[PDB]
Amino acid sequence: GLFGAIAGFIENGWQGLIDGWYGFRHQNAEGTGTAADLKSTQTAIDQINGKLNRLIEKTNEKYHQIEKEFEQVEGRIQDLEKYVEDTKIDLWSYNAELLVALENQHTIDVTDSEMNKLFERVRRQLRENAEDKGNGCFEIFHQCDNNCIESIRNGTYDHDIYRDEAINNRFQI
Amino acid sequence: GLFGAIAGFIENGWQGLIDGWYGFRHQNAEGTGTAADLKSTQTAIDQINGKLNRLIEKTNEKYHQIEKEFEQVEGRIQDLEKYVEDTKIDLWSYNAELLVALENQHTIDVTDSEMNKLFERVRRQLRENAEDKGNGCFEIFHQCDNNCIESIRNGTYDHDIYRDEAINNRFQI
Amino acid sequence: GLFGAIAGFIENGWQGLIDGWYGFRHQNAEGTGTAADLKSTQTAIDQINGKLNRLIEKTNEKYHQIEKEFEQVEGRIQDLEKYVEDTKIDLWSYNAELLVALENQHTIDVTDSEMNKLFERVRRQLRENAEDKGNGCFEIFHQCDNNCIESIRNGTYDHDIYRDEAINNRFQI
Amino acid sequence: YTGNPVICLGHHAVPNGTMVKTLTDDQIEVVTAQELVESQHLPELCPSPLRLVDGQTCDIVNGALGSPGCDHLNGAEWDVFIERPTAVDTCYPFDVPDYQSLRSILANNGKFEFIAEEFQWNTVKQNGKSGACKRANVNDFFNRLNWLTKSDGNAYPLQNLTKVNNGDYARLYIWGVHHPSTDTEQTNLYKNNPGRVTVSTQTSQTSVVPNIGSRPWVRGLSSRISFYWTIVEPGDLIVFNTIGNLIAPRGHYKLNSQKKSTILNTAVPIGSCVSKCHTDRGSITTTKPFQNISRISIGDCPKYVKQGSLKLATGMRNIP
Amino acid sequence: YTGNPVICLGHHAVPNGTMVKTLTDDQIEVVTAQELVESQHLPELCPSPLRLVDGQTCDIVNGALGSPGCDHLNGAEWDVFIERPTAVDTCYPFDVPDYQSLRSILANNGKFEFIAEEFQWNTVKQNGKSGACKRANVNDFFNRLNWLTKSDGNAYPLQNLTKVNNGDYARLYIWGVHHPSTDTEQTNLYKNNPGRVTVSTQTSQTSVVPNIGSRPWVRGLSSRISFYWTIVEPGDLIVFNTIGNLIAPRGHYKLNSQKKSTILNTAVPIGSCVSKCHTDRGSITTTKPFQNISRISIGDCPKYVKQGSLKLATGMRNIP
Amino acid sequence: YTGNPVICLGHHAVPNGTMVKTLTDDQIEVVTAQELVESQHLPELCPSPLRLVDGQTCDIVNGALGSPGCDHLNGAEWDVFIERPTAVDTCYPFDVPDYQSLRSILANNGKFEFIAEEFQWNTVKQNGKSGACKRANVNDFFNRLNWLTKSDGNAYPLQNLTKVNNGDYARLYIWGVHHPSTDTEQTNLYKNNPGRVTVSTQTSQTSVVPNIGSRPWVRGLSSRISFYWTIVEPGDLIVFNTIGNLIAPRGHYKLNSQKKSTILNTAVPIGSCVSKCHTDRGSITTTKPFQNISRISIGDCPKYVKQGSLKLATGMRNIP
């Protein structure tokens, strides 16, 4: 993708994450765990559902057209009827091919972008209390029991509570 | 958008910003203020004007064509004439719909990207002297009178002048 | 581009870099140097050659069509033949124009994105040992001989070896 | 673990995904995709919501003329006339100059509503019948046509008859010209040897001279009929003028003012399912926007494309 | 405030924006948009910069033949011939086989420049006139045609006349064949009963036999004229060979070598504005690339599309 | 330098790049580009891998009739018939109603494979020859046609001949009707004065009456022949019925069941290069997907577009 998160600095996906598209994995004193992030998952699903809705929107209702099969050669007018229908088919096939290629490029970029926006949200919450380890993970420089982990997941983590502990451990002062 | 700045970590826009698309708001000891950023605004306006130029570029000049309305049914050739014109109209309508959808997706991404590039420019100017508060705002860890605010705005802020003050305030050393 | 790296915070390209699309330039006590980055260069080349592959893939084989020029006026069927062919040409010309415009927008973004991903990879390697100077360059806060430069280039730099040195230089403690 | 807490952000994956195409990659793996090209069809045509009329052994043209096997089409109305390739001619061997135009007008109009009119032909015998056109097991003729021949007294006087369209709708008259195989058949049937048929309205006139000669033997005969048609707008009128060889109409078909019907030629049976999209290969029930089943599609249909497969990605890259 | 200065980066917004479509959202709000589909037209046709000729009560075809109400079209040149649906026939009742072709050639050619040529018909009376074709209040005929009939001595000799194109330009000859209503009108006018008209060039020959019979009464008559045309290239020549029923040309129209004109059939008056895009509903003045006004557009026009509205975003998302 | 090491990330550049168009910029500079519109063509047509047959001085139609300069086309098979604009008629002056249809059928079918059949015409003289159609230096005729005229005893009896298609392939029969210049030529050649030609199958019948009159003199004659064609499907049969003016076939052409060939009209010489894409301007050898060389392209060709240049970017922005 354009953002280099999926298939990038996050090295693989998680087969265990079954109730979300994006999520958190943690290890603290009390153990490990994983939960889904609902906001990122829903925004990516809504954008993809939007493109689906844009396509399965059938407005192409035709009744009396032209003949399209001929048992024998007839000359000028049959040549024109065949040529018109071949021209139409070639243009519609080009449109289908290009639409799918563009949409897929964009869908891959959108999902990579949503991965990246989640990473940046957590970064901005942690402020000076954590460091980016380089693989989608943050090293947190204060103890963080299960309630503190959930506070990070649910967006109520207050960095100021932990800042001086974390800064002292980060830099040894 | 792909970058998550507009409609993202920047929570809303400013109705008071009337002479630019992007700008700075500050609070310091001397008071508050707002100014527009001309470079961000002009690059976004120029990109959008470019797409407008690409569209209002009328190159489609036709005189003698075919008959397109018929008082009564006539048979084979009239059917072919109707079918040709209906094929043309459906292809052009598809092109108009896809063009506008694509252009709008891209225009939204372009303007969100310019918001983000302005944010990252300011971050790089501030170096170690400020911290990202998480909502498009920087907390600056030295006093910054109006001249210092404008120096940040006009790209002449020298971080080294304030670095030692700022680092001592950030970390208490 | 969307990422503001090429034609952005990196102010120009390097004419001397002839064996890659992206690379590193360094200065340390032992001197200066420049080397290409193979991974970023190869990923950008592969994406561009993929679009080339999609175009020079020719599937458009026609034999018996219609007449396309006429010595003199003949009336209704000749009008229809001219109109069908001119409608086809206009639609194909629109597709060619839009395809190249879209592809070039995307190619410029892809290469700018690869520049940015290289920059962010190195940033994550350096951890707390270096600071972004704002122009594509990192100021490194420990001595880094030629082997340590190459370790940054080849992704084996261990930040922990130098962290104490660098943090003390960065903040003076 | 060192004892500093870690939080990792990530994304899901599945063991095996689906490959899709993009602008930059011919095949790249994603978590979920959706196929956009319908390739499967029902082996039947569905009779709802569209009104289908099955011609069975009658062509639409033979159905308009009223040939023997076609009485079930009297009064029929359709959105799609289903014409069978096993249809055969059961009556007088005929041709239609500009055949496809008559077929298209009949199919597009969407109904066989015939209004009988009495034509007061004078002296000539009426209701001629033929061995080439048996009904029950007896010589007969097209239902909608009246084969005029000379009287027992060897007279075929000039016929000159008018019908005025003072009604609400356009009228379709189907009429014919008999082409005998010899000169003596010509005089035996019509007295006058160059016959002559002229059929005109205010603004148009089609006029026809019979062609005499031996054609291949079909159902007993080497003579032929050529059929023509005339549309009479409200306020206009039609004149039939002949001195022999006219195969006269018995009335006219009503034309709908909005023509929105069509014809489909296929051997596929009519079943009992529901679908608003028909092909010559059968109906299709799909929400996909494209299909590779047939060029020949009628109704609320996906667009016919060349590709057998186009996968829209509906998830992120799959990296298990 | 705590006393550390704060700088916030942001973007503008307005109270209420415009909703637009994207690939992923049907309707999302942005600060400014611009409509790309022109929906408004002037109630006039604009006579600049394109040259418009108003047929008034004359068809383009009647204008070529020179029917009574058409003298104002002598010598006219147009980019767009404006033909009125209220046009009426004012002369001998006629038809044109392949009518739309004659109309398309005349409209496309772009001018009525008639070159008179004196044809040396022998014995036959010339300049026949008709009650069906009054000019002033007196029996007359098409201006560009010369109705030949038999002499006072009851003779119509074979006519065999040639005109050579040794000039610079292609010539358009318009000629006709008279169809009498009876045999006795045929002999009354032309002596010979099967008339015959053959008109040929080096490479082409159109040949016609008259059709005799009663058609509906129009302006006094049940006879008809069928009109034909022949193009004579430079270096080629034309031969008129007839023994009755020819309605002779009086010359030929000049064909432009570049044919770039057309015709519009509309009731819209010609006004005083400026625009190079015309529809059957009136001219349009717009910079928008698309329009939903009409299929029928001439000049430098937006592309006709089905959609009533397509808004292009010209600003960022609006979040007030 | 201060003594802290620096690492700079950057990208390459060249002194001067290529400018390309994007959605937002009409001209912006990139390091490398590739042109997508082919503008160059070879000045020859390439005779490989497609089979090209050169008509030289013969039309495809004259090649079908067997006019003097066309013997080199006996037995030919082609993917593309190359027809030359300097082709001239070398035989009896003729026309073809719906000429372009006969030419298209012949060109598409892809071969001239003639099957001789002996037709047992009775009484009539056969093998008529003409001054308008010299072969060697002697009066001759089309090779595939048999000009029948009345016998030395002044008889032209009714001709009524049948050929049954019991073979494997559809047959194309090409026949004609002679149009004399006078009545006395008509009787001199055919005795009966209105001649008559009827050619029919089971399902179709084309019938023709000759037109008498003086046409322009071409190679000695003011008479003409009109050519017609009839396709006879397997199981069907053809009947020739005439009392004068038939220009009889000498057999039939074989029609391929798959029609895949075409015709190109150009003066460009055939050389010795290799290419599967031909235009009326010459072949093109290219990988580009588009071309602005000609509308008229045959084979495996780029798509014809209006633009002279479309540059695809293949590198990043160039900032030296």
Ligand SMILES: *[C@@H]1O[C@H](CO)[C@@H](O[C@@H]2O[C@H](CO)[C@@H](O[C@@H]3O[C@H](CO[C@H]4O[C@H](CO)[C@@H](O)[C@H](O)[C@@H]4O)[C@@H](O)[C@H](O[C@H]4O[C@H](CO)[C@@H](O)[C@H](O)[C@@H]4O[C@H]4O[C@H](CO)[C@@H](O)[C@H](O)[C@@H]4O)[C@@H]3O)[C@H](O)[C@H]2NC(C)=O)[C@H](O)[C@H]1NC(C)=O
């Ligand atoms: C100009 O050239 C044409 C073309 O060649 C030529 O046409 C031929 O005309 C003859 C005579 O008119 C046609 O002969 C008829 O053919 C059919 C069918 O033929 C084949 O198929 C049957 C099965 O359907 C096979 O069994 C058979 O062997 C054939 O190969 C026959 O059904 C016809 O039979 C009737 O008439 C015969 C006399 O000719 C009787 O012998 C026979 O019993 C049939 O009797 C009918 O008539 C009785 C009174 O007439 C009546 O009481 C009965 O009810 C019964 O219906 C007949 O053999 C031949 O098909 C034509 N060929 C083609 C290719 O069209 C023209 O004749 C010629 N013109 C001139 C003036 O010479």
Ligand SMILES: *[C@@H]1O[C@H](CO)[C@@H](O[C@@H]2O[C@H](CO)[C@@H](O[C@@H]3O[C@H](CO[C@H]4O[C@H](CO)[C@@H](O)[C@H](O)[C@@H]4O)[C@@H](O)[C@H](O[C@H]4O[C@H](CO)[C@@H](O)[C@H](O)[C@@H]4O[C@H]4O[C@H](CO)[C@@H](O)[C@H](O)[C@@H]4O)[C@@H]3O)[C@H](O)[C@H]2NC(C)=O)[C@H](O)[C@H]1NC(C)=O
């Ligand atoms: C084959 O079948 C066709 C169709 O039936 C038939 O055509 C009909 O021919 C008759 C006579 O030839 C036509 O009669 C003429 O019709 C017009 C107009 O008709 C209607 O509208 C008028 C108003 O415009 C109403 O007032 C009227 O009631 C009608 O409903 C009349 O204008 C004609 O009148 C002239 O001729 C009459 C004699 O027939 C005179 O009585 C009358 O005064 C008019 O006289 C003219 O002649 C005088 C000397 O001759 C002269 O001094 C005057 O200046 C004046 O101009 C006439 O009634 C009828 O319309 C045709 N019908 C159709 C449907 O076309 C063919 O005749 C028939 N062929 C054969 C051989 O039978």
Ligand SMILES: *[C@@H]1O[C@H](CO)[C@@H](O[C@@H]2O[C@H](CO)[C@@H](O[C@@H]3O[C@H](CO[C@H]4O[C@H](CO)[C@@H](O)[C@H](O)[C@@H]4O)[C@@H](O)[C@H](O[C@H]4O[C@H](CO)[C@@H](O)[C@H](O)[C@@H]4O[C@H]4O[C@H](CO)[C@@H](O)[C@H](O)[C@@H]4O)[C@@H]3O)[C@H](O)[C@H]2NC(C)=O)[C@H](O)[C@H]1NC(C)=O
């Ligand atoms: C109806 O209207 C048409 C059209 O106007 C008219 O057609 C003209 O017919 C005449 C006579 O049939 C045609 O005359 C022939 O024309 C050619 C070529 O003409 C021009 O070009 C030549 C060079 O090619 C110039 O030199 C010349 O000046 C012309 O401008 C001539 O080649 C013909 O010559 C032969 O016949 C002449 C007698 O008419 C002889 O004098 C001459 O020597 C040629 O002799 C041939 O015949 C001999 C016996 O007959 C024989 O022994 C020889 O072997 C030799 O082959 C001739 O002059 C004229 O071209 C037609 N014009 C057009 C425009 O088509 C019809 O005649 C008219 N119908 C009626 C009934 O009047």
Ligand SMILES: *[C@@H]1O[C@H](CO)[C@@H](O)[C@H](O)[C@H]1NC(C)=O
């Ligand atoms: C339609 O596509 C399917 C693939 O889904 C393929 O199997 C089938 O052959 C295609 N039909 C035709 C007529 O090519």
Ligand SMILES: *[C@@H]1O[C@H](CO)[C@@H](O)[C@H](O)[C@H]1NC(C)=O
């Ligand atoms: C064209 O679009 C407008 C909306 O802008 C709509 O009101 C109008 O009905 C449309 N015209 C037609 C003929 O549908």
Ligand SMILES: *[C@@H]1O[C@H](CO)[C@@H](O)[C@H](O)[C@H]1NC(C)=O
């Ligand atoms: C085709 O394009 C080239 C530019 O590459 C241009 O010079 C040439 O004139 C074009 N051909 C025509 C016929 O316009």
